[PDB]
Scaffold this active site. Structure first.
Site, PDB file in Angstrom:
ATOM      1  N   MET A   1       2.711  -4.035   2.273  1.00 27.85           N
ATOM      2  CA  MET A   1       2.869  -3.771   3.687  1.00 27.85           C
ATOM      3  C   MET A   1       2.607  -2.308   4.025  1.00 27.85           C
ATOM      4  O   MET A   1       3.097  -1.783   5.029  1.00 27.85           O
ATOM      5  CB  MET A   1       4.246  -4.229   4.148  1.00 27.85           C
ATOM      6  CG  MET A   1       4.347  -5.748   4.057  1.00 27.85           C
ATOM      7  SD  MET A   1       5.482  -6.622   5.188  1.00 27.85           S
ATOM      8  CE  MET A   1       6.966  -5.827   4.563  1.00 27.85           C
TER       9      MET A   1
ATOM     10  N   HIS B   1       4.298   4.079  -1.994  1.00 33.31           N
ATOM     11  CA  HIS B   1       5.010   5.052  -2.762  1.00 33.31           C
ATOM     12  C   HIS B   1       4.767   4.701  -4.250  1.00 33.31           C
ATOM     13  O   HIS B   1       4.006   3.766  -4.583  1.00 33.31           O
ATOM     14  CB  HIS B   1       6.516   4.997  -2.399  1.00 33.31           C
ATOM     15  CG  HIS B   1       7.133   3.619  -2.521  1.00 33.31           C
ATOM     16  ND1 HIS B   1       7.380   3.004  -3.738  1.00 33.31           N
ATOM     17  CD2 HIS B   1       7.544   2.744  -1.578  1.00 33.31           C
ATOM     18  CE1 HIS B   1       7.917   1.810  -3.542  1.00 33.31           C
ATOM     19  NE2 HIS B   1       8.029   1.627  -2.237  1.00 33.31           N
TER      20      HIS B   1
ATOM     21  N   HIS C   1       4.696   1.081  -5.623  1.00 33.62           N
ATOM     22  CA  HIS C   1       3.405   0.426  -5.455  1.00 33.62           C
ATOM     23  C   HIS C   1       2.364   0.879  -6.451  1.00 33.62           C
ATOM     24  O   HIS C   1       1.586   0.016  -6.919  1.00 33.62           O
ATOM     25  CB  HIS C   1       2.849   0.651  -4.043  1.00 33.62           C
ATOM     26  CG  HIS C   1       3.761   0.172  -2.971  1.00 33.62           C
ATOM     27  ND1 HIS C   1       4.547   1.029  -2.232  1.00 33.62           N
ATOM     28  CD2 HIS C   1       4.029  -1.075  -2.525  1.00 33.62           C
ATOM     29  CE1 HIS C   1       5.242   0.331  -1.354  1.00 33.62           C
ATOM     30  NE2 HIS C   1       4.959  -0.949  -1.527  1.00 33.62           N
TER      31      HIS C   1
ATOM     32  N   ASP D   1      -2.434   8.309   4.511  1.00 31.16           N
ATOM     33  CA  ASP D   1      -1.757   8.489   3.225  1.00 31.16           C
ATOM     34  C   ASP D   1      -1.997   7.271   2.302  1.00 31.16           C
ATOM     35  O   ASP D   1      -2.496   7.460   1.172  1.00 31.16           O
ATOM     36  CB  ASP D   1      -0.269   8.839   3.425  1.00 31.16           C
ATOM     37  CG  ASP D   1      -0.071  10.202   4.165  1.00 31.16           C
ATOM     38  OD1 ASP D   1      -0.904  11.132   3.988  1.00 31.16           O
ATOM     39  OD2 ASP D   1       0.904  10.363   4.948  1.00 31.16           O
ATOM     40  N   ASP D   2      -1.741   6.041   2.801  1.00 33.09           N
ATOM     41  CA  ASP D   2      -1.968   4.826   1.988  1.00 33.09           C
ATOM     42  C   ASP D   2      -3.340   4.818   1.309  1.00 33.09           C
ATOM     43  O   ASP D   2      -3.447   4.647   0.090  1.00 33.09           O
ATOM     44  CB  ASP D   2      -1.812   3.553   2.816  1.00 33.09           C
ATOM     45  CG  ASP D   2      -0.389   3.298   3.221  1.00 33.09           C
ATOM     46  OD1 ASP D   2       0.527   4.040   2.760  1.00 33.09           O
ATOM     47  OD2 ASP D   2      -0.189   2.363   4.040  1.00 33.09           O
TER      48      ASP D   2
ATOM     49  N   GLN E   1      -3.884   7.661  -1.341  1.00 32.99           N
ATOM     50  CA  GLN E   1      -3.297   7.264  -2.642  1.00 32.99           C
ATOM     51  C   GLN E   1      -4.136   6.301  -3.441  1.00 32.99           C
ATOM     52  O   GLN E   1      -4.265   6.456  -4.645  1.00 32.99           O
ATOM     53  CB  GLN E   1      -1.888   6.712  -2.479  1.00 32.99           C
ATOM     54  CG  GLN E   1      -1.041   7.622  -1.623  1.00 32.99           C
ATOM     55  CD  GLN E   1       0.417   7.386  -1.822  1.00 32.99           C
ATOM     56  OE1 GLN E   1       0.915   7.487  -2.945  1.00 32.99           O
ATOM     57  NE2 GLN E   1       1.124   7.059  -0.737  1.00 32.99           N
TER      58      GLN E   1
ATOM     59  N   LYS F   1      11.906  -5.201  -7.530  1.00 32.19           N
ATOM     60  CA  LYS F   1      12.915  -4.759  -6.540  1.00 32.19           C
ATOM     61  C   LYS F   1      13.246  -5.905  -5.566  1.00 32.19           C
ATOM     62  O   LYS F   1      14.409  -6.147  -5.243  1.00 32.19           O
ATOM     63  CB  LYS F   1      12.455  -3.506  -5.771  1.00 32.19           C
ATOM     64  CG  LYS F   1      13.623  -2.683  -5.150  1.00 32.19           C
ATOM     65  CD  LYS F   1      13.807  -2.771  -3.655  1.00 32.19           C
ATOM     66  CE  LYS F   1      12.469  -2.601  -2.958  1.00 32.19           C
ATOM     67  NZ  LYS F   1      12.576  -3.119  -1.552  1.00 32.19           N
TER      68      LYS F   1
ATOM     69  N   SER G   1      11.780   2.529  -2.311  1.00 31.93           N
ATOM     70  CA  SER G   1      11.531   1.590  -1.230  1.00 31.93           C
ATOM     71  C   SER G   1      11.021   2.441  -0.060  1.00 31.93           C
ATOM     72  O   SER G   1      11.478   3.602   0.126  1.00 31.93           O
ATOM     73  CB  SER G   1      12.851   0.888  -0.873  1.00 31.93           C
ATOM     74  OG  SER G   1      12.813   0.217   0.365  1.00 31.93           O
ATOM     75  N   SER G   2      10.128   1.837   0.733  1.00 34.33           N
ATOM     76  CA  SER G   2       9.618   2.432   1.965  1.00 34.33           C
ATOM     77  C   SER G   2      10.782   2.685   2.904  1.00 34.33           C
ATOM     78  O   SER G   2      10.731   3.547   3.753  1.00 34.33           O
ATOM     79  CB  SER G   2       8.661   1.453   2.632  1.00 34.33           C
ATOM     80  OG  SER G   2       9.330   0.215   2.813  1.00 34.33           O
ATOM     81  N   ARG G   3      11.856   1.928   2.725  1.00 34.06           N
ATOM     82  CA  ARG G   3      13.042   2.090   3.555  1.00 34.06           C
ATOM     83  C   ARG G   3      13.845   3.378   3.305  1.00 34.06           C
ATOM     84  O   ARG G   3      14.625   3.786   4.156  1.00 34.06           O
ATOM     85  CB  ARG G   3      13.987   0.895   3.374  1.00 34.06           C
ATOM     86  CG  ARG G   3      13.939  -0.153   4.490  1.00 34.06           C
ATOM     87  CD  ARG G   3      12.594  -0.214   5.256  1.00 34.06           C
ATOM     88  NE  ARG G   3      12.659  -1.210   6.340  1.00 34.06           N
ATOM     89  CZ  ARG G   3      12.498  -2.531   6.183  1.00 34.06           C
ATOM     90  NH1 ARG G   3      12.231  -3.054   4.977  1.00 34.06           N
ATOM     91  NH2 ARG G   3      12.588  -3.341   7.250  1.00 34.06           N
TER      92      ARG G   3
HETATM   93  O1  LIG Z   1       4.799  -3.420   0.462  1.00 31.65           O
HETATM   94  C1  LIG Z   1       5.679  -4.064  -0.102  1.00 31.65           C
HETATM   95  O2  LIG Z   1       6.683  -3.577  -0.655  1.00 31.65           O
HETATM   96  C2  LIG Z   1       5.575  -5.586  -0.083  1.00 31.65           C
HETATM   97  C3  LIG Z   1       5.842  -6.143  -1.434  1.00 31.65           C
HETATM   98  O3  LIG Z   1       6.046  -7.526  -1.173  1.00 31.65           O
HETATM   99  C4  LIG Z   1       5.125  -8.162  -0.362  1.00 31.65           C
HETATM  100  C5  LIG Z   1       5.085  -9.542  -0.260  1.00 31.65           C
HETATM  101  C6  LIG Z   1       4.148 -10.134   0.578  1.00 31.65           C
HETATM  102  C7  LIG Z   1       3.218  -9.412   1.313  1.00 31.65           C
HETATM  103  C8  LIG Z   1       3.268  -8.028   1.202  1.00 31.65           C
HETATM  104  C9  LIG Z   1       4.217  -7.406   0.386  1.00 31.65           C
HETATM  105  O4  LIG Z   1       4.260  -6.049   0.268  1.00 31.65           O
END
Ligand SMILES: O=C(O)[C@@H]1COc2ccccc2O1
Ligand SMILES: O=C(O)[C@@H]1COc2ccccc2O1
Lengths: 276, 289
Positions: free
Chosen positions: B38, B42, B45, B86-87, B90, B158, B194-196
């Site tokens: 999504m 980071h 990923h 940025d995405d 990377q 995660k 986490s992006s969060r």
């Molecule tokens: O960016 C992420 O952490 C998530 C990781 O989990 C995902 C599952 C389905 C579609 C996209 C997803 O990306």
């Protein structure tokens, strides 16, 4: 090591992984894999799907035979396929197909609640689930379905578009007995009076298709008149829709569909209609 | 196919273009690896990208799509982090050859019509108060697998419940793809990336370490049994200022209708202010069975 495939004979596989391996290997040798899904008890309507599949150049024909519980004559079905020159029959068990029960399934869009989905509200979820699985198991280039189950066919094309499935869906015209009755294994249940009255479904539809030069209402009234001339034919619906089963447009192409009960037997039929 | 420049990052938005390019690569022997994301990428990923890269003959496709179907009305969707430049920088840096960035319109031309319905695991844990959440995830992951047709698809541990449901999807629909789980990447103090995490003020960031602290405490307490493992985690979480625990549960690795044996997974979810964090760990009970 790939399972044994013998060109020009009927090769039967019950294991999903086996049919998957043979199909993948055949596709890499330049065959085009055609899928014909059936629930067995084969008749001429099934053979017409078979023949359409066979006449694609380089085709190898997969006929699946599987009675889907979420929606039989074994050696006879198999001899019909042998006589048609089909090279693969896929005959899995319920346990092979559903080894973890009903867990992830396909949920159809709103069309699955209408028409046939009135008396059977979960029927189409079962069919889409089983079709999705057969597509992933066999990975065909083309998959063949009869037009007799028109609503089913429309739902399958929605499945394919919606989940970005890379397969061509081919709809094959209804094979009819000489008086027009759409072939179906249920036709054998009809007693003589019923079998004679059952012709009203195809007669009503074809009458409507020709009355349609006079418009939509003439077409529906012609169909209703013919149904009205038959004894013991309880009509559950008679509906004109667009070809995708949305609302009928003011003119252009449509589809007229009917369903009716004769004694305990439920029959269906449908026909292309052109408005004007 | 549209253009494909190797050794460089090729960005495709149309499903048709990535599908064509993917097929061509596979028809010439390369092995297509898919990493669905999504965005707001980071190091968690990039660990997925590196695992994919290390597969011999691989070409890596990373998808970036903020899938509206797995979000609940009420602001979650508009609040998700979007950092496209940025995405893509990377991914370039990692030598990824393909980014798939589809539009909502290209993914949902007919809205929500045909969809995936998950098993009952989707109604529990993260899906308890968000009952349509996993239908959204499984629907988009199915579509991404049909578009790209990878050999293997990579996901972080995660989001462990999501990984499990994805393996369910793949088994249940007979998808010809291998699902690779990759271990959670952690900050130096233990915090699951986490992006969060960007949503934590410095206080909350300090407190957030309690999740991973509790889990690893429990993993070592587990020689003394399940109750000791759970009580250890819980005590650590109780001592954390400002951590509101949603759930803390010990399950079998499939998360499922089997009782916990000797191998388990311990899962936690908690709120710091408005930020909801998840983490989970492998647990061996008693002997380590
Ligand atoms: O960016 C992420 O952490 C998530 C990781 O989990 C995902 C599952 C389905 C579609 C996209 C997803 O990306
Ligand atoms: O036997 C048949 O005509 C039916 C017709 O349609 C089918 C759809 C999915 C699986 C099997 C099917 O077979």
């Amino acid at each position: 090591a790939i399972p044994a495939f013998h060109p020009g004979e009927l090769n039967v596989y019950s294991a999903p992984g086996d049919v998957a391996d043979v199909s993948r290997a055949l596709r890499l040798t330049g065959r085009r894999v055609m899928l014909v899904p059936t629930m067995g008890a084969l008749h001429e309507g099934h053979l017409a799907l078979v023949r359409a599949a066979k006449r694609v150049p380089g085709s190898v024909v997969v006929v699946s035979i599987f009675v889907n519980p979420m929606q039989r004559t074994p050696d006879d079905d198999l001899a019909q396929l042998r006589a048609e020159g089909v090279e693969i029959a896929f005959t899995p068990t319920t346990a092979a197909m559903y080894p973890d029960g009903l867990r992830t399934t396909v949920q159809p869009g709103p069309l699955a609640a209408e028409l046939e989905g009135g008396p059977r509200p979960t029927h189409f979820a079962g069919v889409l689930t089983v079709v999705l699985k057969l597509l992933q198991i066999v990975r065909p280039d083309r998959v063949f379905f009869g037009e007799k189950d028109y609503q089913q066919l429309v739902l399958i094309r929605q499945l394919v578009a919606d989940f970005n499935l890379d397969v061509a869906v081919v709809g094959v015209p209804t094979v009819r007995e000489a008086d027009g009755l759409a072939m179906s294994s249920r036709n054998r249940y009809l007693d003589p009076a019923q079998r004679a009255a059952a012709v009203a479904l195809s007669a009503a539809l074809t009458a409507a298709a020709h009355a349609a030069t006079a418009g939509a209402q003439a077409a529906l009234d012609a169909a209703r008149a013919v149904l009205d001339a038959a004894p013991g034919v309880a009509v559950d619906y008679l509906e004109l829709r667009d070809i995708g089963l949305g609302p009928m447009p003011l003119n252009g192409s449509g589809r007229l569909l009917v369903a009716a009960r004769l004694g305990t037997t439920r029959l269906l039929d449908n026909i292309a209609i052109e408005i004007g």
